[PDB]
């Protein structure tokens, strides 16, 4: 059984980072060297592991989280980062074991006229814990005027639209991201490299 990373990496649509998707990969064999060279990745940074060495290990579970952020925020997808994305949208733990993988998706996720359906959370009462999620679209009432679910004065929508256009500079173009994390438990599933 070959691990279905094609479904992850090549999904037509990607989650908003505030609603980042997670797929559990299990009971399969994957070649991570092949994966490393399967496409042109603008970043491919591993912590505690590396493709060539993954090819010789077995794990209980592999999780593939995926979403879209802008180019200059890929660097927030790392252990011990801060900023809007790391604080409020997608948080890796300090002791992360896995790989962060990104590539420019300007051709797929921009619109001439702007794509506002990719969003990120701009504020939150407190920072995300690692791998915590916050999908609330609820308007935040900052005064006594009820919002009844409508933006306006004292009524802040907590999600900001990226608004991706092809004309944007590289750092503001959309990037698709896949975070592979690797888990070993006393459990029966196994996800192995070709020589594990």
């Amino acid at each position, epitope marked *: 059984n070959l691990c279905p990373f094609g479904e992850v990496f090549n999904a037509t649509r990607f989650a908003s980072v505030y609603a980042w998707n997670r797929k559990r990969i299990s009971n399969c064999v994957a070649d991570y060297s092949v994966l490393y060279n399967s496409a042109s990745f603008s970043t491919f940074k591993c912590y505690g592991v590396s493709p060539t060495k993954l090819n010789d290990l077995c794990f209980t579970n592999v999780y593939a989280d995926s979403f879209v952020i802008r180019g200059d925020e890929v660097r927030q997808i790392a252990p011990g980062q801060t900023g809007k994305i790391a604080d409020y949208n997608y948080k890796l733990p300090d002791d992360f074991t896995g790989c962060v993988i990104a590539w420019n998706s300007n051709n797929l996720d921009s619109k001439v006229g702007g794509n506002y*359906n990719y969003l990120y959370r701009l504020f939150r009462k407190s920072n995300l814990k690692p791998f915590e999620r916050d999908i609330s679209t609820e308007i935040y009432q900052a005064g006594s005027t009820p919002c009844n679910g409508v933006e306006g004065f004292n009524c802040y929508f907590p999600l900001q639209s990226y608004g991706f256009q092809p004309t944007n500079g590289v750092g503001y173009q959309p990037y698709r991201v896949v975070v592979l994390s690797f888990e070993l438990l006393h459990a029966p599933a196994t996800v192995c490299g070709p020589k594990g």
Partner: antibody, heavy 123, light 107 residues
Framework: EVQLVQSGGGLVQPGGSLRLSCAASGFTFSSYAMSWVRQAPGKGLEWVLSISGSGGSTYYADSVKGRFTISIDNSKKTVYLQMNSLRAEDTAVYYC????????????????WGQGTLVTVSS | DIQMTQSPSTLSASVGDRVTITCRASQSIGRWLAWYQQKPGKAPKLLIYDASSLESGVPSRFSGSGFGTEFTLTISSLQPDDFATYYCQQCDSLLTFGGGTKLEIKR
């Protein structure tokens, strides 16, 4: 199940006003951009207006810009289309339509449709 | 604006046939494209979106393909219910439709 139930419509004098309703059930009302699409007798489909799930972004087509208004009542899970200064070229069946997942702000595609409402503009 | 031009404007086929209707965009719209089916006097129904994604509960004989300017809808083995008008639609720059292709019974 997702339902879009349309109300209002009918015959209106040229230059008049009319408001259409679209009553939503069976999904989270604020999780989806909502739109209106119309079809003039014997023609194809024309998108006219949209509003984001939060109500904070509205998008108009130029043939209705300045005359038509789209609005949200969350407690009633209802979309309103307020039509002013109606002309005869506005005679059409008007469809309410719900967008798909990951379409919170802009309508991309029209995954669910209301049953349609005849607006007839004639003297 | 971005204009959508569908081709052919009318197509005649029989049950069991495989049909192919085309939709061309004045400029590149990437994957921002959907196909719909409409019977006379009834609400359209979404069939394909993002050029190639099948909507839920649409029969798998329907497929879509294309990226950029040239898009195709394919019905593999036609059936009675399929005789209808079909519209493509782009959402790359506002939301415009193509003129439509009518699919009629060959006799």
């Amino acid at each position: 199940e997702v339902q879009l139930v349309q109300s209002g419509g009918g015959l209106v004098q040229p230059g008049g006003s009319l408001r259409l309703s679209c009553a939503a059930s069976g999904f989270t009302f604020s999780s989806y951009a909502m739109s209106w699409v119309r079809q003039a007798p014997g023609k194809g489909l024309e998108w006219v207006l949209s509003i984001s799930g939060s109500g904070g972004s509205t998008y108009y087509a130029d043939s209705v810009k300045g005359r038509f208004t789209i609005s949200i009542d969350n407690s009633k899970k209802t979309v309103y289309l307020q039509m002013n200064s109606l002309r005869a070229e506005d005679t059409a069946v008007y469809y309410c339509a719900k967008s798909g997942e990951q379409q919170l702000v802009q309508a991309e595609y029209f995954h669910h449709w209301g049953q349609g409402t005849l607006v007839t503009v004639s003297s | 604006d971005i204009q959508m031009t569908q081709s052919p404007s009318t197509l005649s086929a029989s049950v069991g046939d495989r049909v192919t209707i085309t939709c061309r965009a004045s400029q590149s719209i990437g994957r921002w494209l959907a196909w719909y089916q409409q019977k006379p006097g009834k609400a359209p129904k979404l069939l394909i979106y993002d050029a190639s994604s099948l909507e839920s509960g649409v029969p798998s004989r329907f497929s879509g393909s294309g990226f950029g300017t040239e898009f195709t809808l394919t019905i593999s083995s036609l059936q009675p219910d399929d005789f209808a008008t079909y519209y493509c639609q782009q959402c790359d720059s506002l939301l415009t439709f193509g003129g439509g292709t009518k699919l009629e019974i060959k006799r």
